Write a protein that binds this DNA or RNA. Structure first.
Ligand SMILES: [Mg+2]
Ligand SMILES: [Mg+2]
Ligand SMILES: [Mg+2]
Ligand SMILES: [Mg+2]
Ligand SMILES: [Mg+2]
Ligand SMILES: [Mg+2]
Ligand SMILES: [Mg+2]
Ligand SMILES: [Mg+2]
Ligand SMILES: [Mg+2]
Length: 153
RNA sequence: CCAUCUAAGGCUAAAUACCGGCACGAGACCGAUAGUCAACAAGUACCGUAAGGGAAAGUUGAAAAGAACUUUGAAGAGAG
């Protein structure tokens, strides 16, 4: 499969990908943008402590109705959240990428997230029941995610 | 006055008609939202107590040669 961005050199880079993940697209996009260029260990720690609710993911684009929190100051924002499902999905994929690098014989401790991208996957349909005998959709919003790690000093 | 038939009984092929049926041939027609509703397990799924109503849906590749094997993950799912 082809990636949206090609790495500057394929020798010092590893790739990971997932499709039709059953996690919210907007939450996943926000937490992916939160970890756009961190070191691998830093990103792992950040996602872990997001799950334990010690640091927040700032919601910048899809922020309508998102409440304020005190941990967005360190991001220079006002609205932050703690999406643990997307955090753990990204954690699993980061682990997969780390294993990928260790297979390709890359220095694990020098990897940074070069390119991360979240798309919208095909949606799956459910039904909800409203007043006066009416039915509206109950669609979910899965996502496809790709990630590239690159050796930097 | 003329003209023309012989009712109240019966039979009779051909020339004529044919959006059903069997078997065929063709077209300045349509080309999968078109052409029959129906190119496909279509009067099927499904709805209505019933009379009845009634869809959506074609295309890998020349050939499955349909991805052995290694690796991360519980797996989906990935990298080679
Ligand atoms: Mg409002
Ligand atoms: Mg209801
Ligand atoms: Mg009701
Ligand atoms: Mg007579
Ligand atoms: Mg007679
Ligand atoms: Mg007769
Ligand atoms: Mg002829
Ligand atoms: Mg077409
Ligand atoms: Mg097609």
């Amino acid at each position: 499969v082809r990636y949206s961005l090609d790495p500057e050199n394929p020798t010092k880079s590893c790739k990971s990908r997932g499709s039709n993940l059953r996690v919210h697209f907007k939450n996943t996009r926000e937490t992916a943008q939160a970890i756009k260029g961190m070191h691998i260990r830093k990103a792992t720690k950040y996602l872990k402590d997001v799950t334990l609710k010690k640091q927040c993911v700032p919601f910048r684009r899809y922020n309508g109705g998102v409440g304020r929190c005190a941990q967005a100051k360190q991001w220079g924002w006002t609205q932050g959240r703690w999406p643990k499902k997307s955090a753990e999905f990204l954690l699993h994929m980061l682990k997969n990428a780390e294993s990928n690098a260790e297979l390709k014989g890359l220095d694990v401790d020098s990897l940074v997230i070069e390119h991360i991208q979240v798309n919208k996957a095909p949606k799956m349909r459910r039904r909800t029941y409203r007043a006066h005998g009416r039915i509206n959709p109950y669609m979910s919003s899965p996502c496809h995610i790709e990630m590239i790690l690159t050796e930097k000093e």
